[PDB]
Ligand binder design. Structure first.
Ligand SMILES: [Mg+2]
Ligand SMILES: [Mg+2]
Ligand SMILES: [Mg+2]
Ligand SMILES: [Mg+2]
Ligand SMILES: [Mg+2]
Ligand SMILES: [Mg+2]
Ligand SMILES: [Mg+2]
Ligand SMILES: [Mg+2]
Ligand SMILES: [Mg+2]
Ligand SMILES: [Mg+2]
Ligand SMILES: [Mg+2]
Ligand SMILES: [Mg+2]
Ligand SMILES: [Mg+2]
Ligand SMILES: [Mg+2]
Ligand SMILES: [Mg+2]
Ligand SMILES: [Mg+2]
Ligand SMILES: [Mg+2]
Ligand SMILES: [Mg+2]
Ligand SMILES: [Mg+2]
Ligand SMILES: [Mg+2]
Ligand SMILES: [Mg+2]
Ligand SMILES: [Mg+2]
Ligand SMILES: [Mg+2]
Ligand SMILES: [Mg+2]
Ligand SMILES: [Zn+2]
Ligand SMILES: [Zn+2]
Lengths: 186, 77, 169, 109, 117, 213, 292
RNA sequence: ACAGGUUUGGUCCUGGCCUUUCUAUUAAUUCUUAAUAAAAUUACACAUGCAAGUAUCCGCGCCCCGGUGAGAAUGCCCUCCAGAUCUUAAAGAUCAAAAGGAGCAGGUAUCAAGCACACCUAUAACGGUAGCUCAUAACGCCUUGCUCAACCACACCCCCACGGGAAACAGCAGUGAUAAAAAUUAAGCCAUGAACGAAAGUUUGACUAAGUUAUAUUAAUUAGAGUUGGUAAAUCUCG
């Protein structure tokens, strides 16, 4: 997995020179204009297909977030944006893996990207406001009161309840409703 | 959905809603809860109504509106 | 564009760039200009360059032009009140006419800036809609939230049919 | 204060095309329109009938139409307000003198 | 379109990618479809708890109350929402579901200790 | 130009044809509300009455059966509904002004009557039209008891007129007075004064929409 | 007394300390390029253009506000234990109303504990970041602020970038803001890299954190080595403004003061390494007698 | 378009046709599994089961969703709002019919004239003028949903439904006939939305979760199809 090595090798330096990877690679296609996105994968199982990408024709190359020397040559130097596969000629799989790679690269800052000057979020910052500063907690809180009388369950007059049964007499389902106060269970 | 002029199903015709069962505690509790609730919310509503009243008539008839009117008139002249 | 002798004025850029906006009172504008004289010279330019700027920015204001009726060139303005403005343009420079009009029935820069801000406040960051009106859409997108199954398939647990087959058994 | 007309026409100016009706003037209006392909401004014309008390409009007059608050007919929504240039007799708004074309008939002094 | 009647109503439209529901609080006509036309959008609600374990709810309190002051009706889940926030008093049915759930939890404690015995 | 020209004549015809026929087809309430008891079926409407409504229908009679034992129909005799009884201990009585019986050639049991009100002791002095004359929960009081019913009217002071604005809202008002520069620590009071709703048993006045000019 | 960053003295002294480098101020950026625009100008037009440049550069150069830390805000607006038994995960209620200043927004929570709690500061911010998305900000904290990534970015001498990252990502009164800004200052100090942030808008933070850490060493050394006397002058001036009563201040002031006397008396009265100052303050001095 | 092939013995020039890119149906050849979106030949005819109920009466709801694109150059955009409903201490709010018009709006001029398409009297339904539209396309004919956080139109046909043919799935599933065109006669109101309810709540073929299909993307467990003179990647031996 150790990235830096193969980019400084004499084998690599021999093969690719100081030109980027993919320089000499050329993608064969049906006409003057290549299909708008390259092949899905150039590797399925043990089989390497046709004339392989820059990246996967050479197995000793490793796509990571670590090697900046490999990921550099897939990003536009001046524009700092990546190339779409056809510019380069990499396969879709290695191109998605390359985008995701450059991301974690820039998230660990191993790479450069452009960082703009942003002003502060707020214009005038006053911590003073009542949303920020803790309010005068409710007169209802101080007492330990429910915020309203109806949060509290009140056992009703026996008159109202028996007249209520008197209303619904055939359909009444009557089972005691005192609300046990503490929740937890197995 | 169905329409006015679509016929009702046969299996539907003789079937009339059979009411749900009631509990005394639960019920009277709920009637009160809702009574107080709706009371409160109905108060709030009038507060918001008043709010929009204010915003509106203070936007149309506000001293700044007539200020603009007069200022602009004079400017024009 | 190729044809035309000052084709730059058949641009969109040339149209947006002209600055006069009209007050809400202006309805009609009447340009009376003259063909032959040295003292007409400015007025003509105004018709040839600036009239198509003006109009663009005020598509609801009729702008009419008469030739060689009156021996001296002028503008007229018909406001909502029945106020008739009369702007004498004679030895004036084209630029001078423009700026003079801007003075008389203009809009203060602050007015315009205010209005554009009052329209820009109409599209609110926090809403969710189609890409046309809003920015964000499903809240598939926003970071901490749940990824929407198109991109990232969901836990066996959270699927409907998992719950169904679990409640059945 | 309500007197209105739902029509955008509220004030226009047009030529006077024809006199053929009683106390009603046929007036052609012309506005500039931007042809989107060419990006150019051309003269689109539209005719408006208008109403006249005096029946004062000769053909060829440059006339100021004011929108009428309540429409008379399907085809009459306007009232002639003022005659801007009576034809063949034109008095210069600037100097208030009688004129033909480039020439004053009675000059200053 | 033109309707016979109905009221301005504040409710939950459902945008969702299916098994991942999400809602847009919306000021609408009762007689328009759920996901269709509305007057104005008010807030959103995200049911599914996020990375931090939270259910996000945005509301424009100023506008919400601008419409209630115009007499919009609230759907019951918009009232559950407004309840929790404390912009509105807690909804009665909430409390009842509380009592119900507590009673069932007590009954199930007793079932647990009657099965253990 | 946008120009669309087309006559529609039968657009009007049907309008007139229905309207006219409608008033000839206008069902008299005799045949309309008439009920089949062994079924609980409305012959005219084809509707089958609710399940909480069976018993009351079977055991008691509608207002204009017992308004028809009357010598005079304009009796100032107070009428009371069974449900109003069972819900409220304080007397709900409903008294008559103008009665129009619509004549079932058979039992003369239907009609539109117009009363005055007192609901659970709170008195309402103006004549309305009676709503729901149609239902069997109606009962009539004899002349001797009406003196026992009117005197049970009492008066008591109502529950609190003030309230604590809900937690977030109060928070916001407080924040706005503290940011505006009024530091008064006076609690956030709310008036329940105008919040009065009648109990759902209060019969809804049906005439039209009231216009305040 | 009342010294602070936004005082006119501290401001004008920190603007002069910072410096205008139109090459570092306006530098090639990585954005998609456009073809360059050309026009022919007079000497006059080029001068006016130059001043125009300098004016606009100032706005680019404006200092990011420094502020003290915020305290945690813990307040409960209400409690109903009845709700607690619902055992649902946390609810977060934000207000989005376009008129409001984001410190005046109301952000609230209901936990499974059946209580109404106000949002914490970090919480509050990531909320506003959700519904009022502002560029550069991640709603979940970006990895790069771990110590490893920090050191990696320092190695690459990118420090302007880090300090530009925190301005956007966090809030100026936050905890993390302060941790990262200050730790980053420590790095430029131990590496003597001070001239990095020189024409940057970040210079004000350099000056302040150090005057208040009372290590003026590297900046004075560097200033004298860079052949800038006036900056070391206004800097000691600053240590005197943020430390009015001390031996060094009142003595090396009221005795007498100017370039030589105040810089060398504050080189003797600030002892961190006074040997460094005294060395370099000799060298510059010597390099004058050869040049004049 | 970054263009490429193709007129002639050859050379330019002019000038079509075609290739090369992307999407969608349908077909042929192949085909492993998930997940997500989408699902459609047919305003042809329809077996059967369902798609509105609620509710102490009365009332309220009952093409609203949902379906379709048949019709109509329809219409977009912009004025102005009757009415219906909701809230309410009488004025707000949401839909918004009719009626309008700055401007924009399918083809065709081998459709060039249309044939009363105007106004004036406020007299109070009569009289008086002789007009109006139109080559800046009137009046025709032909084809057609759309400018899409939605809007327009239809609801068995006779534009309109009194009346007449005649007995209506262009609701969900299904089915004959037709067409190159093939989803379950499937489970739930558990979430949302809707209707009623004072309320618990009830109903909802909307919708939710499924089921079927390589129709499109994503992931892998899956290997096959087409090509190989040139444009245009790529060939040996036979017949
Ligand atoms: Mg030839
Ligand atoms: Mg040849
Ligand atoms: Mg030849
Ligand atoms: Mg060919
Ligand atoms: Mg197929
Ligand atoms: Mg539809
Ligand atoms: Mg449709
Ligand atoms: Mg068609
Ligand atoms: Mg047609
Ligand atoms: Mg046409
Ligand atoms: Mg309308
Ligand atoms: Mg022909
Ligand atoms: Mg006549
Ligand atoms: Mg029909
Ligand atoms: Mg019929
Ligand atoms: Mg049909
Ligand atoms: Mg079907
Ligand atoms: Mg039907
Ligand atoms: Mg078939
Ligand atoms: Mg198909
Ligand atoms: Mg079903
Ligand atoms: Mg599905
Ligand atoms: Mg596929
Ligand atoms: Mg196989
Ligand atoms: Zn590859
Ligand atoms: Zn999504």
């Amino acid at each position: 997995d150790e990235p830096w090595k193969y980019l400084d090798s004499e084998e690599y330096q021999n093969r690719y020179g100081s030109r980027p990877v993919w320089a000499d690679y050329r993608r064969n296609h049906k006409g003057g204009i290549p299909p708008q996105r390259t092949r899905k994968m150039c590797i399925r199982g043990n089989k390497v297909a046709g004339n392989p990408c820059p990246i996967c024709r050479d197995q000793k190359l490793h796509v990571d977030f670590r090697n900046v020397k490999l990921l550099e040559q897939f990003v536009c130097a001046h524009t700092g944006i990546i190339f779409h596969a056809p510019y380069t000629g990499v396969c879709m799989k290695q191109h998605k893996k390359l985008t995701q790679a450059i991301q974690k690269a820039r998230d660990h800052g191993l790479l450069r990207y452009h960082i703009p000057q942003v002003e502060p979020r707020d214009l005038d910052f006053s911590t003073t406001h009542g949303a920020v500063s803790s309010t005068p907690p409710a007169p209802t809180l101080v007492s330990g009161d429910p915020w309203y009388p109806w949060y509290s369950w009140k056992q009703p007059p026996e008159r109202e309840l028996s007249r209520l049964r008197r209303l619904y007499q055939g359909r009444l389902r009557e089972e005691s409703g005192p609300p046990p106060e503490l929740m937890p269970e197995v | 959905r169905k329409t006015r002029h679509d016929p009702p199903a046969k299996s539907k015709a003789g079937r009339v809603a059979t009411p749900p069962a009631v509990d005394p505690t639960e019920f009277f509790v709920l009637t009160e809860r809702y009574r107080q609730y709706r009371q409160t919310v109905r108060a709030l509503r009038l507060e918001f109504m008043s709010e929009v009243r204010k915003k509106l008539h203070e936007a149309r008839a506000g001293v700044q509106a007539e200020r603009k009117a007069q200022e602009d008139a004079a400017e024009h002249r | 564009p190729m044809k035309g002798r000052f084709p730059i004025r058949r641009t969109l850029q040339y149209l947006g760039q002209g600055d006069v906006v009209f007050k809400d009172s202006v309805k009609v504008m009447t340009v009376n200009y003259n063909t032959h004289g040295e003292l007409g010279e400015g007025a003509r330019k105004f018709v040839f360059f600036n009239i198509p700027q003006i109009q663009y920015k005020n598509p609801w204001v009729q702008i009419t032009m008469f030739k060689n009726m009156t021996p001296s060139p002028f503008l007229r303005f018909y406001l909502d009140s029945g106020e008739q403005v009369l702007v004498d343009v004679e030895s004036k420079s084209n630029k001078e006419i423009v700026e003079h009009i801007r003075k008389i029935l203009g809009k203060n820069e602050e007015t315009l800036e205010k209005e554009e801000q009052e329209k820009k406040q109409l599209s609110h960051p926090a809403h969710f809609g189609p890409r046309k009106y809003c920015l964000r859409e499903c809240m598939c997108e926003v970071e901490g939230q749940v990824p929407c199954p198109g991109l990232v398939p969901l836990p066996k647990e959270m699927t409907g049919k998992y719950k169904a087959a679990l409640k059945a058994t | 204060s309500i007197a209105r007309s739902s029509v955008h026409a509220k004030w226009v100016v047009g030529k006077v095309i024809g006199t053929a009706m009683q106390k009603t003037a046929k007036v052609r209006v012309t506005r500039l329109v931007l042809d989107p392909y060419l990006l150019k401004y051309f003269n689109k014309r539209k005719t408006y009938f208008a109403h006249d008390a005096l029946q004062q409009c000769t053909v060829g007059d440059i006339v100021l139409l004011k929108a009428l608050p309540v429409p008379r007919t399907k085809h009459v929504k306007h009232e002639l307000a003022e005659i801007i240039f009576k034809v063949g007799q034109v008095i210069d708004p600037v100097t208030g003198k009688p004129c033909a074309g480039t020439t004053y008939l009675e000059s200053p002094i | 379109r033109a309707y016979r009647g109905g009221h301005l109503t504040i409710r939950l439209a459902l945008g969702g990618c299916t098994n991942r529901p999400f809602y847009r609080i919306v000021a609408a006509h009762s007689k328009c479809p759920r996901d269709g036309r509305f007057v104005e959008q008010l807030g959103s609600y995200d049911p599914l708890p996020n990375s931090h374990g939270e259910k996000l709810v945005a509301l424009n309190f100023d506008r919400i109350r601008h419409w209630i002051g115009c007499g919009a009706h609230l759907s019951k889940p918009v009232e559950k929402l407004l309840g929790l926030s404390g912009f509105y008093p807690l909804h009665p049915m909430m409390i009842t579901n509380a009592e119900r759930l507590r009673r069932k939890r007590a009954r199930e404690v007793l079932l647990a200790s009657q099965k253990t015995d | 130009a946008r120009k669309k020209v087309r006559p529609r004549l039968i657009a009007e015809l049907a309008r007139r044809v229905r309207a006219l026929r409608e008033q000839r087809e206008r069902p008299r309430d005799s045949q309309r509300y008439a009920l089949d008891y062994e079924t609980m079926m409305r012959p005219h409407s084809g509707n089958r009455l609710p399940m909480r409504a069976w018993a009351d229908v079977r055991h008691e009679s509608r207002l204009l059966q017992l308004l028809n034992r009357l010598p005079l129909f304009g009796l100032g005799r107070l009428v009371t509904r069974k449900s109003w009884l069972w819900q409220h201990d304080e007397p709900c009585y409903w008294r008559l002004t103008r009665v129009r019986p619509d004549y079932a050639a058979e039992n003369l049991d239907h009609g539109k009557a117009w009363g005055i009100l007192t609901f659970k002791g709170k008195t309402e002095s103006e004549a309305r039209e009676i709503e729901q004359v149609m239902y069997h929960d109606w009962r009539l009081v004899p002349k001797h008891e009406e003196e026992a019913f009117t005197x049970x009217x009492x008066x008591x002071x109502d529950t609190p007129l003030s309230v604590p604005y809900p937690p977030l809202l109060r928070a916001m008002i407080l924040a706005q007075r503290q940011k505006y520069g009024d530091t008064s620590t006076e609690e956030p009071m709310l008036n329940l004064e105008r919040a009065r709703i009648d109990p759902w048993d209060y019969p809804a006045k049906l005439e039209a929409k009231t216009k305040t000019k | 007394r009342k010294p602070t960053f936004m005082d006119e003295e501290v401001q004008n002294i920190l603007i002069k300390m910072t410096g205008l480098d139109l090459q570092k101020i306006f530098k090639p950026a990585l954005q998609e390029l456009k073809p360059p625009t050309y026009k022919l100008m007079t000497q006059a037009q080029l001068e006016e253009a130059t001043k125009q440049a300098v004016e606009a550069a100032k706005v680019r150069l404006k200092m990011p506000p420094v502020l003290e830390e915020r305290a945690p805000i813990n307040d409960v607006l209400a409690e109903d234990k009845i709700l607690e038994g619902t055992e649902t995960a946390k609810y977060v209620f934000t207000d989005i109303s376009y008129s409001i200043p984001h410190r005046e927004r109301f952000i609230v929570v209901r936990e499974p504990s059946g209580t109404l709690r106000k949002a914490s500061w970090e919480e509050r911010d990531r909320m506003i970041q959700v519904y009022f998305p502002r560029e550069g900000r991640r709603i979940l904290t970006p990895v790069i602020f771990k110590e490893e990534n920090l050191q990696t970015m320092y190695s690459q001498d990118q420090h302007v970038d880090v300090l530009n990252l925190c301005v956007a990502q966090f809030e100026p009164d936050s905890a993390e803001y302060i941790k990262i800004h200050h730790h980053t200052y420590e790095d430029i100090d131990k590496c003597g890299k001070y001239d990095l942030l020189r024409s940057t808008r970040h210079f004000g933070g350099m000056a302040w954190y150090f005057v208040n850490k009372k290590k003026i060493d590297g900046l004075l050394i560097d200033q004298i080595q860079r052949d800038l006397v006036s900056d070391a002058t206004s800097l000691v001036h600053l240590y005197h403004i943020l430390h009015p009563x001390x031996x060094x201040x009142x003595x090396x002031x009221x005795x007498x003061x100017x370039x030589x006397x105040x810089x060398x008396x504050x080189x003797x009265x600030x002892x961190x390494x006074x040997x460094x100052x005294x060395x370099x303050x000799x060298x510059x001095x010597x390099x004058x007698x050869x040049x004049x």
